[PDB]
Each structure stands twice: as structure tokens, then as C-alpha cells.
Amino acid sequence: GMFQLHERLAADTHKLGESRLCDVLLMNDNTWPWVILVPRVSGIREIYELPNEQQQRLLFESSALSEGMMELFGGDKMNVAALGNMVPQLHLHHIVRYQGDPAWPGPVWGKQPPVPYTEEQQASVKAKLQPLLEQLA
């Protein structure tokens, strides 16, 4: 069917760009570098519900994004997850972690309130990510 980004994902993110398969979204919490891939395929709840070739494309994009974010943000560890307990539209979290970050070594989700990006922080991180995003096209 006709893919439409879920309203909660739209509300919680800024759009960074588009890969071949996915919308590339910045989670609007500047506490951690946090990018979401949303495959533009209607009605998908789980990775396994994608056709095999689209699973493999998502993997290619996710692995390329993760490795690139690690270098770009000088991270200590990646966290990658598909959760979706309250948003049924499949989306894949990519979060750069640091031994010095506020949640370490636990998970980030629900640790503390989000801090929205300022205009200049949003533009800076979008710009920083464009080379990597172009790799995903």
C-alpha cells in the first residue's frame, strides 16, 4: 500500500534525508546521537515481515549507518534496536553511546526527559550526516 510515516515518529523526530529504502530521522533528543531508519513499506511491524531482499537492504543500510555514525560521532559503542511497543510502524534505532553518557551502561529509553535540538544544533547534525546519508542512496 501507500506508506505513510506514523504521526508519533513524525512528532518525535526531524527528517535528515532518505536512503534507498528508508526515511532517515533524527530522534529529537540531543542527549545522545540517535538516528532512526523507517523502511517506506506499508503495514510492517517487524523486520521479519519485510520481503527477504528488503530485509537485506535494511541490513546493508543499518550496518553502513552504524559504522559511519561511530566514526562521525567518535562513539564508544553502538546500540541498535527494533522495539515498537507503542508505534507499530517498523523503525530501527541507532544510538551512539559513550562511557561518559548519562545512561551508561544501561539503555537510554525512559532514563530522563528528552532535550529538543535547537535550530542550529539540528542544522549542524544534518549537515554532518550528509556524506554518510549519500552512501545509503
Added chain:
Amino acid sequence: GMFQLHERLAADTHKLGESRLCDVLLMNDNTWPWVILVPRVSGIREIYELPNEQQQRLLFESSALSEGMMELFGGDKMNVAALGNMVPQLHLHHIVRYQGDPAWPGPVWGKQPPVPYTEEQQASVKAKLQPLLEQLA
């Protein structure tokens, strides 16, 4: 090099068996149905560090495991993640969620100390998972 299961993973789990690529581990917490895939390749921290063909095999196994667990445990939603902030050996979590389960709708990690399976509970869940384990060969 010579793969060796990380001591913390060994301590926290019961080994169900092996897939083509991985150790298939039961997380030793009966609070949620939770199985961990550990690729049997030394020195890997992140999915993207595997050779592409092992990344694709891990994906296949993860998707087969997840879809199978959903039907076997009558789940509402899967949660799949590679975190590894404490344990550097790549391992991929697969947790069956139900509406209203413990910690719902948040993620499970760090929300309760584990409750070990008793001998009899371990035998039950092992028997329940055996067909699906075999599908990962």
C-alpha cells in the same frame, strides 16, 4: 581466532544449542521469553564488523527465530536489539512482549533482576523451543 563465549553470557544463560552461525542461548530470566544469538566468531563487537555474508546469515537466523517465537509464545510484539554496553561480545536479543507484561510498554533491559528458570521450567521451555532451534541449522 578461537571463539569463546563470554563468561557473563555463559553465566546469565542456558545454552539451547547452536544454529549455523551462532550459539542459541536462553536468557535465564523467566519473566519474559528471551533468546540471545551469539555469532561464533572471535573478536566481534558490532554487527557491521562481521563479513557481509555472516551479517546476512545472522539476519536470516534472527528473522526466523523472531517469527517462530511469536507464534510459539503467542506474542504481541517482538523486541530485537544489539546493545552490549557491558559485554563486548556481539549478541542479539530477541524478547517476546505482551501488552501489560512486566515493564510494558518500556524495554526490559535493567527493569528487574532476572528470575532463574527452575530445572523443570528449563526442561519445559527447552522442549518447546527445540523445533524452532532446528530451523536455524
